[PDB]
Copies of this chain bind each other. A is one copy, B any other.
Amino acid sequence: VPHKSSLPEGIAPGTVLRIRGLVPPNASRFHVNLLCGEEQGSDAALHFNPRLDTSEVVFNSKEQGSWGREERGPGVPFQRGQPFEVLIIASDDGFKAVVGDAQYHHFRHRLPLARVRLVEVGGDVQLDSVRIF
């Protein structure tokens, strides 16, 4: 961490981002970002932000340097000291977040999916693997 998977050909409907790792014992929060470029502060088609400290999972986007309106999933299917598996699945309509074996949240596209060019995973997380199919 901070992880960085470049996506020069972008991502299309039917793309699966598979993220496996450990939330370490003193973790505050971590994030998975689908970014439109490599510059610092690049627009984000999806910002996925489990907050162990506040017991929420936040979803948002960023454009022109300005954040959108946050969406929240139900509860927090993550725990300090426990490993996790997250799927982020691109459809034509948005991103499906799967945590464990349960569909967790659907985030409607706000930026065109064709803008995505990079996946960034950072924060308080010890990554096992990041794979993009």
Interface residues of A (CB under 8 A from B): 12-16, 87, 89-93, 96, 98, 101, 103, 129, 131, 133
Which of B12, B87, B96, B103 touches A91 (beta carbons < 8 Å)? B12
Q: Is the CB of A14 within 8 A of B90?
A: yes
Closest chain B residue to A91 by CB distance?
B14
Closest chain B residue to A100 by CB distance?
B131
Q: Is the CB of B98 within 8 A of A133?
A: yes
Residues of B within 8 A of A103 (CB): 133
Closest chain B residue to A95 by CB distance?
B14
- Bound-state Cα–Cα, A11 to B15, Å: 15
A103 to chain B, nearest CB (A): 6
